Design a protein around this ligand. Structure first.
Ligand SMILES: *[C@@H]1O[C@H](CO)[C@@H](O[C@@H]2O[C@H](CO)[C@@H](O)[C@H](O)[C@H]2NC(C)=O)[C@H](O)[C@H]1NC(C)=O
Ligand SMILES: *[C@@H]1O[C@H](CO)[C@@H](O[C@@H]2O[C@H](CO)[C@@H](O)[C@H](O)[C@H]2NC(C)=O)[C@H](O)[C@H]1NC(C)=O
Ligand SMILES: NC(=O)OC[C@@H]1N=C(N)N2CCC(O)(O)[C@@]23N=C(N)N[C@@H]13
Ligand SMILES: *[C@@H]1O[C@H](CO)[C@@H](O)[C@H](O)[C@H]1NC(C)=O
Ligand SMILES: *[C@@H]1O[C@H](CO)[C@@H](O)[C@H](O)[C@H]1NC(C)=O
Ligand SMILES: *[C@@H]1O[C@H](CO)[C@@H](O)[C@H](O)[C@H]1NC(C)=O
Ligand SMILES: *[C@@H]1O[C@H](CO)[C@@H](O)[C@H](O)[C@H]1NC(C)=O
Ligand SMILES: *[C@@H]1O[C@H](CO)[C@@H](O)[C@H](O)[C@H]1NC(C)=O
Ligand SMILES: *[C@@H]1O[C@H](CO)[C@@H](O)[C@H](O)[C@H]1NC(C)=O
Ligand SMILES: *[C@@H]1O[C@H](CO)[C@@H](O)[C@H](O)[C@H]1NC(C)=O
Lengths: 173, 120, 1140
């Protein structure tokens, strides 16, 4: 079922990027209605200007130029109880860099209890010119090779020592 | 079926107090809103019934003119008890006394019938 | 003179028969349940016959001598009781007629006296019970210790409920509780999981949980199950544990506590089920079986025109043609059954007719041979043979079908047995059935008599209550499916209890009939009823049973493979390789870093294994390498991994296979089997028995097929019903009687669905699955309700229309499960016996090293006397030694421990402070006295004290006990964390364990358990590996299935920890039916094929019906095979210890 996964923090310039904000209800069985707000403050500047609001099925987008155009909803569709809210940007630009805060509003319907809750997920992304390979990927690949080389060296090493001994035994008798 | 225990005939001296004792028994635990008890009197076998006391949330004594203020409730229903007391019995009190008990959730309605006879 | 006449009357052929005939008739009358008024006179006559029968015996035997002859026999005491009782009732009697009347059932017991040889069987049964005295003591003690551990660890836990956070009008949790008492009222306030009887159980820890947001967890109110399921009091805890031991609906207790308690406590259940249930039950079987052999064997040892007909008639006899004509017919019979196997709910009109045409030909051929058969040997000669008469009845039935209960028609399939004569194993099954009504007929008859008495007794005692109460038990105000109101129904409940299904029904009886009465009756049926069933099973089973530089290189590689570091290094890789498997699952997306290393890590593993395999080829060569079973397994695994790696590097991946192939990885732990010596030994034993198992399976399959075919004709296509989708409640049938009517409702109504069961009798293959559930008793009841309810193929089912179809299930259970299981168990244990004989009479469940150790444990059995010790010279030292040495002093300590044990029992939930303080203080005195005893033994004994093993255990217990009290105290001062504290107190239970030292009988049994630990460990290791492979297959395959029944948050296949919890639960095959059900549904509207699943790539939550069925079924069978193995190990050791 639903799992919470943190969004990627580096977006290549001039390429599409997807921001992931996923919020999971404590109990899957319960049914509630959700809506979301994403506010972004550009790097080097204080505060957040709400950029988009998604309620019902239609997505409302603020008129600011930084994000004018370039945004599409990648969230749960037709559910009306979103669970997963994600924003996808086409044609990523430097202007799209900084801190992103996404707040979720959920109406939970219980037997005689109606509960309104707020959870805040904030995503911070920095634009870079060229995709940078993750350090974990690089360390592991280099690390894996060393093991492959060391083991083989060890295996070959025994044979030179073991084999010579075996050859020696035949001659003695 | 509600279990009802009453004396079929109750003989009481004129001027004494007559406790009309009936036992109602059914499964479950009695509920105040749920438990309802009704008592009616008849001068004779074929005679019209006159309700004189009810339990609906609490005891309601209808204060029928024929009894003056001589009727009292005399039972703790939670105990399956719904007895009534007729103080200072008079000859005109002779007749048939009916106890009807309907107890939710029990669908069945209990009925006890006492023939009260007044001595001399 | 009169005495002679009476005496003459007393011993007569007819009189015994006359007394007996009336009694059987009397039994039919008890079954009335509201007999007419006219029947009362008949009641008087029965009273008359007994007095007359009773009077003569007393008149002749007594000689007016005090009835010395008459009352000397024990059975006669029973008759006197019955006569007075019938008579006493007319006389002034006690208030409860039903309680008093129940005695009349005693007359049924008289039947035991009248039938010849029955008296002997009952006596035989009582003798067996005597042997069970030691096991009973241990069982009570064992249940008692667990009850104490359970109570301390889980008391008050079942209470948790989710209480909502915001309350209007300044209400308080305390204020709310007293004022309201209604399910509707309660629901508004606490969570309640969509129609469950009670509130959802919540938990404090991260592992357990969880309550929806806006609801908080607090503990208040009654425990679930009417308050019956709770760990609050010792008595209640004892009932909960007893249920676990007999494994009745044990899965729910397990699921419920884990949820409130948290998953970490799953450990408690593993130890209890593994030691408490599998082991304790086995001990009972061994003792009953062992006891039966001595008595059975001991008793056995003491004994030791006209002329034309003849011409034509002679020709017919030549026509018997045993070499070919007789043989030819059997091929025909096998073919016929196969023909019958083809049926389905939906059958085309042309196909339906073809089946009819085909049947007639077969019916005709069987009759012609019979008519033809008659001419050749003559009628008298013809009916001489039993099979012939058997064949004749079937043929006659078919002829009648054409013109003159069509079900009987379905009956010709039995004919299939005829093959029994040719088959060695089938002959055995035929033999087993015969023994029950043959030599063992008297014993089997007793079972029938006992079931009858209980059904009637239950009916008399609780029949009235169920009707009046109904509501306490049912929301609707109508009788539940299982009730004690009628004899057939009362009988069904008793039969259910024979299978271990007692708890579900008992809660119902208790609500209506009260705790004291319901508990006593059910407990007796279970203990007494089961003992008879156990005796029949065991009795039946036992009786039935009896340059050339290349050469140097080749030599060297051989050196490398043989070397220990390499063998050792390879094993480490296997464990490590297997472990990486556990990490993958739904949560892998999170923790992206671990995912990257694991992906890379596998490549190094693939290279190492491929490298290792090459060394194997050079060292062994191809011929040696491929003639080994293990290597093929090993060679095959590397290949699957190798193909994925080559395909993966290349790209061109994810196109089904190879992608399906990736799922095959779960097989990686499989190479581990060869490496471990312990695991391999167990596997060798199973391979030895597969051929033997195969033979029994064939008989089971053929036998089950007849039941399955029979079932298909009766219920095929009749399980459909129109149900309200919101609550899944079938419509009344007053409206929407047929399928056609149901559809009209849908057109004008949104949520009404016409739907099938999912496990049913639509086709022969499905019938096999339905039968499997009934055989195991899991998921069986849903099916039975469907069968009885059913009316016709396209018609809505009426409630309990068939009612007598229950009989079909009862017959299958007796034949399908009781007999085959008898056969399955008999062959497997025997095969194991042959294996033991072959390998020099040595246990086949232990590695060679284990064998040396097993012998050392055997040495502990010896009683050679240890040195007495010398009193120290000092008198002061000596008197203490003198006092300590005395046996009387030791008995006092034993009494003291028992006193200590009773103190623990008094503890209960919400006891109060004054109560709590006294218990704490009494406990301190106990610690001081016990510590005091230890010091005293030490002063006198000195170095000698340390010599005894028991003294050391006693000394260790004291150290643990003082520390436990102090640490709890330090913890209280330090504070923070209640949970560490409860576990700390568990130390006191240590003193109770010392009781074992005192009882000689219990110790022998305990010693036996210790002896089998080495064998049990190997099986446990093998079992764990199989469970592990399955968990991995499950994680990939079943995560994402829609959550329905048995699958919910927790107890789901989403992660490895979760998968393990489920697999352990199903090992006992409990709830296996529930888990399988979500997997079965495929396609709308059962499920959505493409579902978003936020945070993951995968789409849809549809179980694979084919893959799911193979997986659950295979697991059930495999676990069962290993468990059969566990019983064999316990029995072998038990015979040896008892034998010594
Ligand atoms: C199927 O069952 C549902 C669930 O009870 C029924 O829905 C109820 O209908 C009545 C009257 O239409 C409403 O007052 C209740 O509120 C409904 N329950 C809820 C909670 O929705 C429904 O009537 C049934 N379907 C049909 C066609 O009868
Ligand atoms: C299936 O059930 C329906 C419903 O009763 C039967 O069709 C008719 O039902 C209507 C009510 O709408 C009655 O007026 C008719 O009398 C019913 N049929 C007849 C001939 O009386 C129908 O017969 C049932 N059987 C089917 C359709 O196979
Ligand atoms: N309904 C059914 O199959 O009846 C048998 C019994 N009763 C239940 N309510 N169960 C819950 C699930 C289950 O497996 O069906 C079962 N769990 C066990 N141990 N036996 C089953
Ligand atoms: C990028 O930012 C600059 C200044 O912050 C602004 O003038 C420009 O319009 C932005 N780009 C777009 C496409 O709006
Ligand atoms: C996210 O938006 C892109 C824009 O085209 C769309 O193609 C993609 O399918 C969306 N995500 C999903 C639900 O696959
Ligand atoms: C990105 O924006 C530029 C304008 O600066 C536009 O020409 C280009 O088409 C955009 N990229 C894509 C993939 O459309
Ligand atoms: C709760 O619901 C109300 C609707 O009455 C809405 O105005 C409010 O914003 C919600 N609360 C939150 C925290 O969004
Ligand atoms: C009140 O008494 C009458 C007798 O006339 C009876 O019919 C009725 O059921 C009683 N009311 C209730 C609520 O039981
Ligand atoms: C608590 O209950 C009292 C009733 O005595 C009420 O007057 C008061 O308003 C309640 N408190 C709150 C915070 O509502
Ligand atoms: C609903 O019944 C109406 C009759 O008014 C019919 O026209 C319609 O086709 C039916 N619905 C379906 C899905 O067949």
């Amino acid at each position: 079922g639903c799992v919470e996964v943190d969004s990627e923090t580096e977006a290549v310039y001039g390429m599409t990027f997807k921001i992931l904000c996923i919020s999971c209800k404590r109990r899957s069985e319960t049914n509630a209605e959700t809506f979301t707000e994403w506010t972004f403050r550009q790097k080097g500047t204080e505060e957040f200007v709400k950029i988009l609001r998604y309620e019902n099925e239609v997505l409302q987008l603020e008129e600011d130029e930084r994000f004018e155009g370039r945004v599409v909803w990648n969230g749960s569709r037709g559910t009306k109880d979103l669970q997963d809210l994600s924003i996808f940007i086409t044609n990523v630009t430097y202007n799209h860099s900084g801190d992103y805060e996404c707040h979720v509003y959920r109406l939970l319907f219980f037997e005689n209890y109606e509960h309104n809750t707020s959870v805040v997920k904030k995503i911070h992304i920095e634009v870079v010119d060229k995709a940078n390979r993750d350090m974990a990927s690089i360390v592991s690949e280099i690390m894996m090779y060393v093991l492959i080389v060391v083991l083989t060296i060890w295996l070959v090493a025994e044979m030179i020592y073991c084999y010579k001994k075996i050859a020696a035994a035949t001659e003695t008798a | 079926s509600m279990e009802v225990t009453v004396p079929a005939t109750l003989n009481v001296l004129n001027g004494s107090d007559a406790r009309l004792p009936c036992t109602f028994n059914s499964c479950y635990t009695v509920n105040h809103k749920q438990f309802s008890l009704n008592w009616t009197y008849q001068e004779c076998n074929n005679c019209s019934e006159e309700m004189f006391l009810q339990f609906r949330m609490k005891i309601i004594n209808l204060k029928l003119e024929r009894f003056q203020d001589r009727v009292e409730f005399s039972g703790n229903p939670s105990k399956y008890d719904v007895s009534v007391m007729l103080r200072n019995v008079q000859p005109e009190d002779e007749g048939i006394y009916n106890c009807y008990i309907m107890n939710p959730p029990d669908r069945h309605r209990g009925h006890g019938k006492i023939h009260l006879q007044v001595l001399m | 003179p009169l005495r002679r006449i009476s005496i003459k009357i007393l011993v007569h052929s007819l009189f015994s028969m006359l007394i007996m005939c009336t009694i059987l008739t009397n039994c039919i009358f008890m079954t009335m349940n509201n007999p007419p008024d006219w029947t009362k006179n008949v009641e008087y006559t029965f009273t008359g016959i007994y007095t007359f029968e009773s009077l003569v015996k007393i008149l002749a035997r007594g000689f007016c001598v005090g009835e010395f002859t008459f009352l000397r026999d024990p059975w006669n005491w029973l008759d006197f009781v019955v006569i007075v009782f019938a008579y006493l009732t007319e006389f002034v009697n006690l208030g409860n007629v039903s309680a008093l009347r129940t005695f009349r059932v005693l007359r049924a017991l008289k039947t035991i006296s009248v039938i010849p040889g029955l008296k002997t069987i009952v006596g035989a049964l009582i003798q067996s019970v005597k042997k069970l005295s030691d096991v009973m003591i241990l069982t009570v003690f064992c249940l008692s210790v667990f009850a104490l551990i359970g109570l301390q660890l889980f008391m008050g836990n079942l209470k948790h409920k989710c209480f909502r956070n915001s309350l209007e009008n300044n209400e308080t949790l305390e204020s709310i509780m007293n004022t309201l008492e209604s399910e509707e009222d309660f629901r508004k306030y606490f969570y309640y999981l969509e129609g469950s009887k009670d509130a959802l159980l919540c938990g404090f820890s991260t592992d357990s949980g969880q309550c929806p947001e806006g609801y908080t967890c607090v503990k208040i109110g009654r425990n679930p199950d009417y308050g019956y399921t709770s760990f609050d009091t010792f008595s209640w805890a004892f009932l909960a544990l007893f249920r676990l031991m007999t494994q009745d609906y044990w899965e729910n207790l397990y699921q419920q506590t884990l949820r409130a308690a948290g998953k970490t406590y799953m450990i408690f259940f593993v130890v209890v089920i593994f030691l408490g249930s599998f082991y304790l039950i086995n001990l009972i079987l061994a003792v009953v079986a062992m006891a039966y052999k001595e008595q059975n064997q001991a008793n056995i040892e003491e004994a030791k025109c006209s002329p034309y007909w003849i011409k034509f008639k002679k020709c017919i006899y030549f026509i018997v043609m045993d070499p070919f004509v007789d043989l030819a017919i059997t091929i025909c019979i096998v073919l016929n059954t196969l023909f019958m196997a083809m049926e389905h709910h939906p059958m085309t009109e042309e196909f339906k007719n073809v089946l009819a045409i085909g049947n007639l030909v077969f019916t005709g051929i069987f009759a012609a041979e019979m008519v033809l058969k008659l001419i050749a040997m003559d009628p008298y000669e013809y009916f001489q043979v039993g099979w012939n008469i058997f064949d004749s009845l079937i043929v006659t039935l078919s002829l009648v079908e054409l013109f003159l209960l069509s079900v009987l028609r379905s009956f010709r399939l039995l004919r299939v047995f005829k093959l029994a004569k040719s088959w060695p194993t089938l002959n055995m099954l035929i033999k087993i059935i015969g023994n029950s009504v043959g030599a063992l007929g008297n014993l089997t008859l007793v079972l029938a008599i006992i079931v009858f008495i209980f059904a009637v007794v239950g009916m008399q005692l609780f029949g009235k209550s169920y009707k009046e109460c109904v509501c306490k038990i049912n929301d609707d105000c109508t009788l539940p499916r299982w009730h004690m109101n009628d004899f057939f129904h009362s009988f069904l409940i008793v039969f259910r209890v024979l299978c271990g299904e007692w708890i579900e029904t008992m809660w119902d009886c208790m609500e209506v009939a009260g705790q004291a009465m319901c508990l006593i009756v059910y407990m007796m049926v279970m203990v007494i009823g089961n003992l008879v069933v156990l005796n029949l099973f065991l009795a039946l089973l036992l009786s039935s049973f009896s340059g050339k530089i290349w050469w140097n290189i080749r030599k060297t590689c051989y050196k490398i493979v043989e070397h220990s570091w390499f063998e050792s290094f390879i094993v480490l890789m296997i464990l490590l390789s297997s472990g990486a498997l556990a990490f993958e699952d739904i949560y892998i997306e999170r923790k992206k870093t671990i995912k990257i290393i694991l992906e890379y890590a596998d490549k190094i593993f693939t290279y190492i294994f491929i490298l290792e395999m090459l060394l194997k080829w050079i060292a062994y060569g191809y011929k040696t390498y491929f003639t080994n079973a293990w290597c093929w397994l090993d060679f095959l695994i590397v290949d699957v991994s190798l193909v994925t790696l080559v395909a993966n590097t290349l790209g061109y991946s994810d196109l089904g296979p190879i992608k399906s192939l990736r799922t095959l990885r779960a097989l990686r732990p499989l190479r581990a089997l060869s490496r471990f010596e312990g695991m391999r030994v167990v596997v060798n034993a199973l391979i030895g028995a597969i051929p033997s198992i195969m033979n029994v399976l064939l008989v089971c399959l053929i036998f089950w097929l007849i039941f399955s075919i029979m079932g298909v004709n009766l219920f095929a296509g009749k399980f459909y019903e129109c149900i309200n989708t919101t609550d899944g409640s079938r419509f009344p049938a007053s409206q929407v009687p047929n399928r056609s009517e149901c559809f009209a409702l849908m057109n004008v109504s949104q949520n009404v669905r016409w739907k099938n069961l999912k496990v049913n009798f639509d086709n022969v293959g499905l019938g096999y699955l339905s039968l499997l559930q009934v055989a195991t008793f899991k998921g069986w009841t849903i099916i039975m309700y469907a069968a009885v309810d059913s009316v016709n193929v396209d018609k809505q089912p009426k409630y309990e229309y068939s009612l007598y179809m229950y009989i079909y299930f009862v017959v299958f259970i007796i034949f399908g499960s009781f007999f085959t299981l008898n056969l399955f168990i008999g062959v497997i244990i025997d095969n194991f016996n042959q294996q033991k004989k072959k390998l020099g009479g040595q246990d086949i469940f232990m590695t060679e090293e284990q064998k040396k150790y097993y012998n050392a444990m055997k040495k502990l059995g010896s009683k050679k006397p240890q040195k007495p010790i010398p009193r120290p010279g000092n008198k002061i030292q000596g008197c203490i030694f003198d006092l300590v040495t005395n046996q009387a002093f030791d008995i006092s300590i034993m009494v003291l421990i028992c006193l200590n044990m009773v103190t623990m029992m008094v503890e209960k939930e919400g006891q109060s402070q004054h109560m709590t303080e006294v218990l704490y203080w009494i406990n301190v005195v106990f610690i001081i006295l016990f510590t005091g005893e230890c010091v005293l033994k030490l002063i006198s004994l000195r170095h000698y004290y340390f010599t005894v093993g028991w003294n050391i255990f006693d000394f260790v217990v004291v150290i643990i006990s003082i520390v436990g009290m102090f640490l709890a105290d330090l913890i209280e001062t330090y504070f923070v964390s209640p949970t560490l504290f409860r576990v700390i107190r568990l130390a006191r239970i240590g003193r109770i364990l010392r009781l074992v030292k005192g009882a000689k009988g219990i110790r022998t049994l305990l010693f036996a358990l210790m002896m089998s630990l080495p064998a049990l460990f190997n099986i446990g290791l093998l079992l764990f590996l199989v469970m592990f492979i399955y968990a991995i297959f499950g994680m990939s395959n079943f995560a994402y299935v829609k959550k329905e029944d048995g699958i919910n948050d927790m107890f789901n296949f989403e992660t490895f920890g979760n998968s393990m919890i489920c697999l352990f639960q199903i090992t006992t095959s409990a709830g296996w039916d529930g888990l399988l059900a979500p997997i079965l549904n495929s396609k709308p509207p059962d499920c959505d094929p493409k579902k978003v699943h936020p945070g993951s790539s995968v789409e849809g939550d549809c179980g694979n019906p084919s893959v799911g069925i193979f997986y659950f079924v295979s697991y059930i069978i495999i676990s069962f095979l290993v468990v059969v193995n566990m019983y064999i190990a316990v029995i072998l050791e038990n015979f040896s210890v008892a034998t010594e």
